[PDB]
Amino acid sequence: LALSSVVVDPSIRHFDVAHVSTAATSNFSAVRDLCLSECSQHEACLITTLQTQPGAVRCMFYADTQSCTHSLQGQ
Amino acid sequence: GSLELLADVQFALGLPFYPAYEGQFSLEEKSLSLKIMQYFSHFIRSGNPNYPYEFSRKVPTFATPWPDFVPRAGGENYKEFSELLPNRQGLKKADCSFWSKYISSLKT
Amino acid sequence: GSLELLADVQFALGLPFYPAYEGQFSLEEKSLSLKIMQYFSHFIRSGNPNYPYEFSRKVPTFATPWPDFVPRAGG
Amino acid sequence: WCVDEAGQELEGMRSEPSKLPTCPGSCEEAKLRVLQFIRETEEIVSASNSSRFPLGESFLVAKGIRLRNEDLGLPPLFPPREAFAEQFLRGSDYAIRLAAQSTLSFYQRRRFSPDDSAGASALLRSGPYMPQCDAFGSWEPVQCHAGTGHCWCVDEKGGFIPGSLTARSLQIPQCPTTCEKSRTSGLLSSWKQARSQENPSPKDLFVPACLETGEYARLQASGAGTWCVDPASGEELRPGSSSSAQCPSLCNVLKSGVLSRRVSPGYVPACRAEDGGFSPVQCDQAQGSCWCVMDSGEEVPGTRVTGGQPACESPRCPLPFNASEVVGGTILCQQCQLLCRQGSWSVFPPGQLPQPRACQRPQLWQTIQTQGHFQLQLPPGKMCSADYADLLQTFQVFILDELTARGFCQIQVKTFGTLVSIPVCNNSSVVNVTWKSRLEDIPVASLPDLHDIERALVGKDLLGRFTDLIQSGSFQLHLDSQGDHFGTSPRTWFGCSEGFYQVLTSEASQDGLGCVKCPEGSYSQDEECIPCPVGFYQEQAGSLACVPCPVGR
Amino acid sequence: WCVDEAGQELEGMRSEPSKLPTCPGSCEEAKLRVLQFIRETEEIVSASNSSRFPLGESFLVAKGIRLRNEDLGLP
Amino acid sequence: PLRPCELQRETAFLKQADYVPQCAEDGSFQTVQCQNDGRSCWCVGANGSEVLGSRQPGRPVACLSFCQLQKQQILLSYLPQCQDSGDYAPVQCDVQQVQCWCVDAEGMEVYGTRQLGRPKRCPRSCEIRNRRLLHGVGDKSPPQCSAEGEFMPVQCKFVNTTDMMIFDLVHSYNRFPDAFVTFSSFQRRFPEVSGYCHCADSQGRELAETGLELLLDEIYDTIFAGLDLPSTFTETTLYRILQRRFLAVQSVISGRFRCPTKCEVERFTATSFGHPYVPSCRRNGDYQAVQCQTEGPCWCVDAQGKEMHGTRQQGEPPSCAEGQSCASERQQALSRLYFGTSATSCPPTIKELFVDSGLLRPMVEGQSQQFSVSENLLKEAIRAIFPSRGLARLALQFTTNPKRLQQNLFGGKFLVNVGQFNLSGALGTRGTFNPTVGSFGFEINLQENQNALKFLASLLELPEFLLFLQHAISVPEDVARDLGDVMETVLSSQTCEQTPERLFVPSCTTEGSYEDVQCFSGECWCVNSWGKELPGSRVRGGQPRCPTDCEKQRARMQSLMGSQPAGSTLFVPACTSEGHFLPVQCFNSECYCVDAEGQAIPGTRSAIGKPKKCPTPCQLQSEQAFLRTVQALLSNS
Ligand SMILES: *[C@@H]1O[C@H](CO)[C@@H](O[C@@H]2O[C@H](CO)[C@@H](O[C@@H]3O[C@H](CO)[C@@H](O)[C@H](O[C@H]4O[C@H](CO)[C@@H](O)[C@H](O)[C@@H]4O)[C@@H]3O)[C@H](O)[C@H]2NC(C)=O)[C@H](O)[C@H]1NC(C)=O
Ligand SMILES: *[C@@H]1O[C@H](CO)[C@@H](O[C@@H]2O[C@H](CO)[C@@H](O[C@@H]3O[C@H](CO)[C@@H](O)[C@H](O)[C@@H]3O)[C@H](O)[C@H]2NC(C)=O)[C@H](O)[C@H]1NC(C)=O
Ligand SMILES: *[C@@H]1O[C@H](CO)[C@@H](O[C@@H]2O[C@H](CO)[C@@H](O)[C@H](O)[C@H]2NC(C)=O)[C@H](O)[C@H]1NC(C)=O
Ligand SMILES: *[C@@H]1O[C@H](CO)[C@@H](O[C@@H]2O[C@H](CO)[C@@H](O)[C@H](O)[C@H]2NC(C)=O)[C@H](O)[C@H]1NC(C)=O
Ligand SMILES: *[C@@H]1O[C@H](CO)[C@@H](O)[C@H](O)[C@H]1NC(C)=O
Ligand SMILES: *[C@@H]1O[C@H](CO)[C@@H](O)[C@H](O)[C@H]1NC(C)=O
Ligand SMILES: *[C@@H]1O[C@H](CO)[C@@H](O)[C@H](O)[C@H]1NC(C)=O
Ligand SMILES: *[C@@H]1O[C@H](CO)[C@@H](O)[C@H](O)[C@H]1NC(C)=O
Ligand SMILES: *[C@@H]1O[C@H](CO)[C@@H](O)[C@H](O)[C@H]1NC(C)=O
Ligand SMILES: *[C@@H]1O[C@H](CO)[C@@H](O)[C@H](O)[C@H]1NC(C)=O
Ligand SMILES: *[C@@H]1O[C@H](CO)[C@@H](O)[C@H](O)[C@H]1NC(C)=O
């Protein structure tokens, strides 16, 4: 997905955190596929978000949470 | 009045968007029925018509918030399915005070 | 409230113009008590608080007319 | 002629029996309404000069009293006061805004520091919000208001996607166009679009596919099959003769829409018969003015002339880099120049390899600068008791410390009762002191207009206190172990941030769009984007420095 | 000098230490008020000739919107 | 443990000299210092024995801080980088960007922070002290620490009479091998250990002779004994038991359900040593808007006590009013006027779900029985008993009966126990005896404190408190940091009944106070000093006469008469049409003739029915001007 389809909501209480520490950084595809395989191993997590920490890579796992705006033009 | 479904179950189940009742319903009725759909869905998903999830607790934006029904005096809040969807406090206070306090004592 | 005469018999007998109750009463009270004096006088002279005589029947001008008390519904 | 949605003929004379009309877009109509408002609030001011109407007339109009020309001993329509009175009666709120803009325009136009004073337009008041359209007439996905500093994001036709509002940010808002919104809607909650709206089947519902720019891709695929779709909005491109393989090019179907009078651009597209792309030189059927376009007829802004066949030849065949297409624009005819899309500015002085990523989208202003002066430029000319200029940075530090001790570097302003602080000092003292205030540090709740920031900064709080402290009395730093002088320009001027580029150097730039982020293959050094040196490589935007690669130098 | 009934000094400069003042009658004061109204409705017309004020200013005054000289870039 | 500033201050105090060093907390000299009423101040360097070299009479306008003093010393290498205010930045770097470290606004370097380049997550004082206690520093009980690296306002050394002698047991070692979660099991494993709690400074220094309380572990019977270990004693529920018991004991003391902030500590220190300037506080625990010195210089400060440099007035009240609140809404409405052709009242999801719903209405107004101070006391109670949303969540998903809630939060129905002065706080430095001064010179009224404590005890048994606290958990975090901020905001939204038009500009004075009449769209109305229109004052035409003292008194007396028994009557003042007092204002049988603004005339008290000859307002003004002139005739020269 793209960052334009995201609403920030810090009140969610159904999420997990996982740091991956690397100073001399590996290929970002490797840690990306590792976190995707980690969510693939489980069944409850449906959304995986990767963010670049200064000393690590933060993988955040969420259940499917959406905010829908319904109107007479477009949902 | 030709229908058998009254206005609350008209709006909650969303009659104005039906293909059968195509042009019979106005536009503001079609928006209000969408808001009442969102209320009933948010209830039967989470348990609170203001929030779609049990854990999100984001501020509602689609309509005005629906207050809880505290049973004592000073509250007893209820939603009104009007165009603006306002909040009120007393529903039939004189009539239910007659039918509960007085006439039950007269019955005994 | 210090008086024992209530407001109707205050205005009808005209307490605000008394020398005893000199400055205790406002000016609009002093005009209203004059109008109520005229009402009670027009009653106890003729029998109708709108007219001072039984035979004049001129349009009242001092205040608004006082309608009769019809006993049925609608009046 | 052109018509409204509800069967109403728009304002404008009917087109000639063989003459193509043009209908404005959704954004363009609203821009015409805003220009109508500006014209009316200018004509009220022009009436106010001529003294043609009494002062109390509008008070009678507001109170509801309307006197006709007969009641005032006048001919029935010799003074057009009826239309002027009706101007204040086409609404309440529109009338109050008309009165406010008229009062402002009259007082400023007749007191813009005139001939009896200096001038220079110190107030420099910005007009109302006029919407910014696309090249064709559709709504731009982000609208920015220069007066306050808001930059919200609109829908397809209306406005204000809720929650998308931002105020005084360095980063441009990233909100999706009409394709990507429906794309994420179809991917997330399966709210797909319909191929044909009359009576669809579940085979007719598709999740749309967008390009990297944002527009619709050419071939949409559903469960039933594939078809060709209009790139602007997602309806069936050729509802009569749709073909999956080798779908028709834009020029041919556009011309078919023009001749059938379903689309009104005002002209007829004369495209190339070879590939179906646009020939460079489409123009009006009445020969008149002619121009040049990029692909899809996007109207190169700098080439429209009344001369026959404006020369817009293809440039020299080698390109500065193997990326062939210049992003957002083209090169028109080093014998040629570079011109790009509407509402975009070339960061480079030619408007010598001309870089592909050479123009971006301009942003709002970000810093406000003012300056003050002293006569300690040279030691023997003032009472510093020295004749040495070898150390002067220590004096700069000492003056800055004395200043920030005496306020003067953290302006305090009320917000609904409670005070807030805004820094205005960083290496100001040079003597010359330069207060440079960052707009992002100032909130939107306090100082809600840029001119309010100018009033609060040049006012009593900072620049009123400074001149009072210097000219009356002295604050003389001892240094035992300053000279007063006029500044010749004691005024605000806006400027971009450290990483960006100030494109229109005239501070009188309307619409407040003078800051452009420094592009991909360049670095910002002296408020100018210099292309990166040969041995180095740059991959950020607004990066301030360029990075070398060891492998493959 | 001259005074109103409710202890208010009337408009007019105080008379000299040995100089007799003159106070207007009941009718003469009302005539002075009418002449004041005529002078104001003449000075509004004289302002309207000189084109010294915008046309929409009185509309803002009627609507309740009051802009001071600071808001219009004025002394 | 006393700093050089504190010892210099106490030595000058014991000599009874003309000068004592003004000494702010964290053992630091104030950058401005004066003699005791000597009226010639000066600005002093870092060690307090210095002088800027030019002492002016009165307070100096401003002067350089320790940052700038050290900087001017080094210029006249390494450059000490400082912020706008007088405090060293938490990252200090060399002038070449090769070495950076952390300081604590006094200069000495934290040992571990020295490294190449810029550091991230600079440790603060609590983490430094808590790590030092694992490196051999004497006290082996770790001080109680917040979520960030900051000391809790209320701390507990928690160990006394270890092996019959009074010192601190090795608590950081003690907690780990023996898992205690239960007080009865704790005394079974470790008897004769009683919790010694107090409250601390900003640096964590224990307050002198105040709050040194001891608590007995015997009384409490434990609830919530089904949870895992929380990895830190500060995260154990026993620490909340001790903190709630300590705060409940200090509720009847000091009039406040908290340890006092920086304002009260500075004010008490200034009052005790007799400093020429004492800060002026208020109920919540912040510096007041106007803070003058003893006679001459009056000025305004922020919430941290730093002087706003451009408001020193020298005798005149500077009047930086927080009630001065027009210009914001004025320029907001003016900006909304000039948009195009397209703080606040209250946060949006609060008024409909809290105030109008009927949740705060029994909380503060249903039993609003002489509780002017008790609303702030209730804010402190909500902030202190529930310090985080998670603990309130746990308390609300365990306690299914509101009757038992006080048994699970406080010390086992401790609250009625501290309602009748039962003893669990023996052997402490506060008390020993019994208008009345507090622990820090607070004005105490014991029956108000006990009545409010019983009211809070009764309120905590209410299920509507449980529902309100569910709703207060459900608020988003951005509106309010903690539950006390939620409680403050829901009090603030009681007067947020404002749905104004977009373009109503509020006209207001040159100094910015609201004009008495506000007009829009052909209507006009009277407002008070706050932005609420007076009910019924809206007029169709324009220019309403705003009500005088008599009309406000008449409305107030009529409204108060509306809730009173039948035969009882009160004094309702009677006014004219314009609003002046009627010349004779009479009561039960005694008619007196008033002069003006409700002030009775002596010598005219008489019975009803006797005709009066009270003077006209001319004779009243004649008396007033006669007294004015004879007083002015008594002029000196
Ligand atoms: C929708 O609802 C369903 C119904 O509840 C739900 O399915 C359940 O999910 C839970 C997830 O915890 C399952 O519980 C697991 O069951 C297995 C059975 O073998 C246990 O072994 C698990 O324990 C271990 O699992 C891993 C094994 O390697 C270990 O890594 C881990 O550490 C555990 O020790 C665990 O208890 C449960 O069996 C299902 N099914 C049912 C019928 O309850 C589903 O997850 C919900 N969500 C979605 C998106 O469908
Ligand atoms: C982590 O490992 C350490 C290893 O030292 C554990 O410490 C040991 O814990 C046991 C159980 O609490 C202690 O036994 C106790 O001994 C006393 C002696 O009088 C006795 O009275 C008790 O009944 C109990 O048996 C043991 O002394 C202690 N060893 C030490 C401190 O060296 C620790 O418990 C482990 N962590 C956890 C959480 O258990
Ligand atoms: C970074 O490292 C990963 C992990 O080795 C590389 O991923 C491999 O890529 C090749 C071809 O791209 C695949 O055939 C392998 O299956 C991938 N996985 C592994 C485990 O080898 C990746 O190519 C590296 N380089 C980058 C991202 O530039
Ligand atoms: C004052 O305190 C003592 C000790 O806390 C109270 O004695 C307890 O009283 C309760 C019932 O009131 C008994 O159930 C306990 O067994 C008592 N002993 C304890 C807790 O050790 C005493 O009642 C209190 N005084 C009052 C309430 O007036
Ligand atoms: C009015 O218009 C004339 C020209 O039409 C211009 O010279 C003048 O400056 C304007 N303003 C005033 C105040 O007369
Ligand atoms: C450069 O672009 C051309 C496209 O015309 C392509 O054929 C060629 O392979 C490209 N060369 C490199 C090195 O990318
Ligand atoms: C700005 O001021 C800082 C603070 O002393 C100084 O270190 C720096 O060299 C100055 N110049 C620039 C360009 O940052
Ligand atoms: C200071 O300002 C004056 C006037 O703006 C200018 O002439 C002078 O060169 C400036 N000094 C420096 C060092 O730039
Ligand atoms: C305005 O005043 C001038 C002289 O002051 C006069 O000649 C003229 O007739 C007046 N009216 C107009 C409409 O100019
Ligand atoms: C302040 O004291 C420190 C050590 O106590 C000393 O190093 C420093 O020189 C002193 N500064 C003075 C006396 O100015
Ligand atoms: C001046 O007169 C006032 C008025 O009684 C008095 O209080 C004061 O003491 C007098 N001062 C002197 C110096 O006489």
Author numbering:
A (entry chain A): 2096 to 2170
B (entry chain A): 2620 to 2727
C (entry chain B): 2620 to 2694
D (entry chain A): 899 to 1231, 1243 to 1260, 1274 to 1352, 1364 to 1414, 1426 to 1497
E (entry chain B): 899 to 973
F (entry chain B): 30 to 105, 115 to 380, 405 to 496, 547 to 749
Sentences from the paper on this structure:
The thyroglobulin (TG) protein is essential to thyroid hormone synthesis, plays a vital role in the regulation of metabolism, development and growth and serves as intraglandular iodine storage. TG is simultaneously a precursor for thyroid hormone (TH) biogenesis, the synthesis of which is itself modulated by thyroid-stimulating hormone (TSH) signaling, and the carrier protein responsible for iodine storage in the follicle colloid.
Here, we present the cryo-electron microscopy structure of native and fully glycosylated hTG from healthy thyroid glands to 3.2 Å resolution. A cryo-EM map at 3.2 Å nominal resolution was reconstructed allowing atomic modeling of the hTG dimer to around 90% completeness (2,483 modeled residues over 2,748 expected residues per chain). Poorly resolved parts of the map, in particular at the N-terminal and other flexible parts, prevented modeling of the full-length protein. This composite map is the result of a globally refined consensus map and two maps locally refined around particularly flexible regions, the “wing” (3.8 Å resolution) and the “foot” (4.1 Å resolution). The hTG dimer is ~250 Å long by 160 Å wide and 110 Å along the C2 symmetry axis. The interface between monomers buries an area of 31,100 Å2 involving all regions except region II. We identified 57 DSBs over the overall hTG structure stabilizing the protein and three types of cysteine-rich internal homology repeats in hTG: type 1, type 2 and type 3. The ChEL domains and repeats 1.6–1.8 form the core of the dimer and lie near the C2 symmetry axis while regions 2 and 3, as well as the remaining type 1 repeats, occupy more peripheral zones. We modeled 2 of the expected 4 hormonogenic sites, namely site B and site D. Acceptor tyrosines of sites A and C are located at the extreme N- and C-termini of the hTG chain and could not be modeled likely due to the inherent flexibility of these regions. Out of those, 14 asparagine residues showed an additional density in the map and N-linked glycan structures were modeled. Our structural characterization also evidences features of hTG that were previously unknown: the environment and possible function of the 4 NHIs present in type 1 repeats; the previously annotated linker region which in fact is a NHI of repeat 1.5; the globular nature of type 3 repeats, which could be annotated differently, and finally the flexible nature of the wing and foot regions.
